[PDB]
Amino acid sequence: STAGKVIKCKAAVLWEEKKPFSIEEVEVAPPKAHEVRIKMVATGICRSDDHVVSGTLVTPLPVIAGHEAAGIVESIGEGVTTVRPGDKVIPLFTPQCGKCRVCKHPEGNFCLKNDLSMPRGTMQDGTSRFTCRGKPIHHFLGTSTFSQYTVVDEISVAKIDAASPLEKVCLIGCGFSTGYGSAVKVAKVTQGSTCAVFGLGGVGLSVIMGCKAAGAARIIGVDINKDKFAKAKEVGATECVNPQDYKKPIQEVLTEMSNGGVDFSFEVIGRLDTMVTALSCCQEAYGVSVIVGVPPDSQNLSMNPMLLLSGRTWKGAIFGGFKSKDSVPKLVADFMAKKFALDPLITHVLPFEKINEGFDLLRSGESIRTILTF
Amino acid sequence: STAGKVIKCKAAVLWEEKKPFSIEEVEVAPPKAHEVRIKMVATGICRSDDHVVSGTLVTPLPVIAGHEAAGIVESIGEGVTTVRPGDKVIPLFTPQCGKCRVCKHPEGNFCLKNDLSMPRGTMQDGTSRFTCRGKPIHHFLGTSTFSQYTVVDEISVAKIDAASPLEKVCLIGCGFSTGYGSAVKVAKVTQGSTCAVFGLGGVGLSVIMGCKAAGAARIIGVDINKDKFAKAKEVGATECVNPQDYKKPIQEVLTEMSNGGVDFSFEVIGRLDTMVTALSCCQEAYGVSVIVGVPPDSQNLSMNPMLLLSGRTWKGAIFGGFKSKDSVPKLVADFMAKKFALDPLITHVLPFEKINEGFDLLRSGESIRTILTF
Ligand SMILES: c1cnc2c(c1)ccc1cccnc12
Ligand SMILES: c1cnc2c(c1)ccc1cccnc12
Ligand SMILES: [Zn+2]
Ligand SMILES: [Zn+2]
Ligand SMILES: [Zn+2]
Ligand SMILES: [Zn+2]
């Protein structure tokens, strides 16, 4: 009885940069062909959502942001074959069209239909399904999860276990999948290995979890905030190191600790200096360093390529290297089959309308993950 | 007959940097425990030998350089189990001790016993087997091939097919294996793939031969010297590009030519600008870019880490990523089996005593590869 009609609901609109989100009444158009309308149940607050606020992630405004979420299908446009009204679903901020050279590639996952490279802030057909008092509002990464209802292209949604707790599995829409995949899928951490993780927020913890799932012998957490350590240890970290405690450069400390360099290093914080450090502390002949985080923005790092000529590998990925529509449901199935825990990452839960408070907790560092409930 | 005794012979001694090599009468001590004295039959002139001349590659002087060679064992010290007097051998500038964390690693080849990282210019025991007028002369990379006779540690030598033409296979000691391995072993070039090779001197052509051995559909040669193109095409290149013919940046041209980026790219000339270019032109989601050459010395490159966050892999290696003692014999086996040709690389052949002439040909760029014959 809302199918095929406009829905009136609340969303969190960013009218301008460096402003709070504004709770507005919006009109959400019904789904056109190959589009899916979703009732949001929960959405996480991610660093990249805050980058939209600070102009760091350039995307058209005004916008409904949000990209880490889970909800329930309310209706499907014509042609949709992969989800039905009633299904529990996760929006995919990286799509899997299944047709482009990337989706066809055994390794690649950055589907060329993404809206991240050159953001249009629209549906795939170049239009928006959102208005706020007749004014068009842009989409974000084809997801736009800071709304009671959103419409997504079918390539940007996956059906998940009908019995999953959406307030938890929403993490699989970004933060968890991104860290966990980095270890398990991008670095392909091996049993017995020594790992180093730079950044112990939610994505870092997710990397640690992946390293533990992979059977790593040592997982060295690195952060200047020592209050992040207990939780890191709790999810699998063997040791934690605070660089401010040391007189000598941190890769030197990590090289000594690992008897000549770690097997896998991960930079989660998104900082140009720790990126080079992280490459450097991995073992010169067969070390792997993986980039996870976006920097505060643009600007080159400076780096000596002899770090690579000995044998090091340097790489990065989006969404932990996972092909989005194939992987998300199995990640959920694994969580349901108890192969990993999500509770440790969730430190704050708030009603959707206290969104701005949620961003305050992110910006101050007090939160690991805030989930907003609808 | 000379076994257990000092041999008087000639060598090319570099007494000082930026000097020409000096043909001197030297004394070559007999091999101690686990050492092997070799009569040299051929040695190539490699770019890294010239880096020793310019003070670019810092190693103790005075020195006997040379590291790409083949010859015959004239005697063995006690313990030597892997070669016998009379065996055709290739010295291994990257050793394979078989015992360190690296030789144990199924991907590493940069054996920790190497003398490249922190050059001592000695045998493994911290001594020299070379004197000139009683004065000690340093070794180089445990190989010192610019001598009628050398002594090397057993870890730095490999027995090869007794019917090998040593004037040809000597290229397996560095230049060929380095390029070819970069394609075959380091990048793991795949069938149907599109490859770009920056620099078409000898090591670049060896990359091209590797890409073709791996079954690439497209091999794009890139050099500012168009005179290098015919040989490039002759060993497997499908097209050649000279950046100076173009008005736009060469990675744009290569991205457009490859419909959105190459699968595998290789920087073979060792320049910082081409490194970034090479990386950039590879496909953003699953592209792999391999660094083969040593910069003109230090200088950091400047690079935007967003190039990696989309999914790019950036890596380097020494000696084409080959475990040296295991691999050198099989490469000769394959050459003997006619699985690849070495003649297209051999552009000049000179007697050992014209060493300086050979370096002039290298430095001017008239040579692909000069082989010196004893
Ligand atoms: C779009 C959305 N979220 C992300 C990115 C891009 C890139 C990096 C990243 C790292 C951690 C958490 N989320 C993101
Ligand atoms: C020792 C000897 N030869 C080399 C190196 C080190 C490093 C790089 C390289 C690249 C091309 C050819 N030779 C070498
Ligand atoms: Zn796709
Ligand atoms: Zn995110
Ligand atoms: Zn070793
Ligand atoms: Zn060499």
The CATH code of the domain that includes B329 is 3.90.180.10
- Strand (E) positions, chain B? 7-14, 22-28, 35-44, 63-64, 68-76, 88-91, 130-132, 135-137, 149-153, 157-159, 194-198, 218-222, 239-241, 264-267, 288-291, 301-303, 313-316, 348-351, 370-373
Signed CA dihedral, A222, A225, A230, A231: sign only: negative
Contacts with A269 (C-beta within 8 Å, 6 or more apart), sequence order: A198, A199, A201, A204, A293
**Which tokens hold the place of B116?**
């490249």
Residue A318, ligand 1, Cβ within 6 A: yes
B123 vs B155: CA distance, rounded Å: 11
**Which of A146, A318, A362, A368 to mutate for ligand 1's pocket (most ligand atoms within 8 Å of CB)?**
A318
Task: State the number of CA atoms in the 13 A half-sphere of B152 facing the CB.
Answer: 42
A283 vs B102: CA distance, rounded Å: 9
Of A174, A186, A177, A214, nearest in space to A290 by CA:
A186
Same domain, A83 and A229: no
Across the interface, do A117 and B310 touch by the CB < 8 Å criterion?
yes
A197 vs A290: CA distance, rounded Å: 10
CB A245 within 8 A of CB A224: no
CB A207 within 8 A of CB A197: yes
Nearest CA to ligand 2 atom 10: B293
Same domain, B353 and B273: no
Decide: helix, strand or coil at residue B286: coil
Chain B: closest CA distance from residue A111 (Å): 8
CB atoms within 10 A of CB B306: 17
B5 vs A363: CA distance, rounded Å: 75
Ligand 2 binding pocket, CB closer than 6 Å: B 46-48, 67, 93, 116, 174-175, 178, 203, 292-294, 318
> Can you list the pairs that B191-194 forms with residues at least 24 positions away whose Cβ atoms lie under 8 Å?
B191/B215, B191/B216, B191/B217, B192/B216, B192/B217, B193/B217, B193/B218, B193/B263, B193/B264, B194/B218, B194/B220, B194/B258, B194/B262, B194/B263, B194/B264
Same domain, B224 and B365: no
Same domain, B45 and B126: yes
Q: To one decimal place, what's the resolution in Å?
A: 1.9
Nearest CA to ligand 1 atom 3: A48
Question: Which residues of chain A have a CB within 8 Å of the CB of B102?
Answer: 285-286
The CA dihedral of B159, B162, B166, B170, to the nearest 10 degrees, is -30
Same domain, A32 and A155: yes
The CA dihedral of A6, A12, A13, A14, to the nearest 10 degrees, is -160
A142 vs A120: CA distance, rounded Å: 9
Chain B: closest CA distance from residue A1 (Å): 42
Question: Which residues of chain A have a CB within 8 Å of the CB of B105?
Answer: 285-286
Out of B291, B317, B343, pick the residue that ends a domain.
Answer: B317
Across the interface, do B308 and A318 touch by the CB < 8 Å criterion?
no
Same domain, A162 and A186: no
Question: Which residues of chain A have a CB within 8 Å of the CB of B107?
Answer: 286, 311
Choose the closest CB to B298 out of A283, A304, A316: A304
Same domain, B127 and B194: no
Q: Which CA distances in Å does B121 have to A189, B58, B60, B61, B143?
A: 37, 10, 6, 8, 10
Signed CA dihedral, A259, A265, A267, A268: sign only: negative
Out of A287, A317, A347, pick the residue that ends a domain.
Answer: A317
Same domain, A270 and A329: no
For A67-108, the three-class secondary structure string (H helix, E strand, C coil) is CEEEEEEEEECCCCCCCCCCCEEEECCCCCCCCCHHHHCCCC
Nearest CA to ligand 2 atom 8: B293
> Nearest 5°: CA angle at B84, between B80 and B85?
120
Domain extent at residue B136: 1-178+318-374
Amino acid at A137: I
**Could you give the residue numbers annotated as active site of B?**
46, 48, 51, 67, 174
**CATH number where B295 lies:** 3.40.50.720
Across the interface, do A110 and B301 touch by the CB < 8 Å criterion?
no
Choose the closest CB to B305 out of A109, A285, A301: A301
CB atoms within 10 A of CB A348: 17
Contacts with A267 (C-beta within 8 Å, 6 or more apart), sequence order: A198, A199, A274, A275, A277, A278, A289, A290, A291, A292, A293
B237 vs B222: CA distance, rounded Å: 10
Same domain, A188 and A330: no
Across the interface, do A314 and B310 touch by the CB < 8 Å criterion?
no
Question: Which approach determined this entry?
Answer: X-ray
Signed CA dihedral, A329, A74, A34, A52: sign only: negative
Across the interface, do A110 and B308 touch by the CB < 8 Å criterion?
no
Same domain, B29 and B174: yes
Question: Which residues of chain B have a CB within 8 Å of the CB of A318?
Answer: 309-311
A361 vs A367: CA distance, rounded Å: 5
CB B309 within 8 A of CB A290: no
Label residues B170-204 b or e (16+ Cβ within 10 Å = b). bbbbbbbbbbbbbbbbbbebeeebbbbbbbbbbbb
Same domain, B148 and B27: yes
Same domain, A254 and A357: no
Q: From the CA of B46, how far away is ligand 3's center (Å)?
A: 45
Chain B: closest CA distance from residue A344 (Å): 26
Q: Count of domains in chain A?
A: 2
**Which of A43, A45, A48 to mutate for ligand 1's pocket (most ligand atoms within 8 Å of CB)?**
A48
Out of B317, B344, B362, pick the residue that ends a domain.
Answer: B317
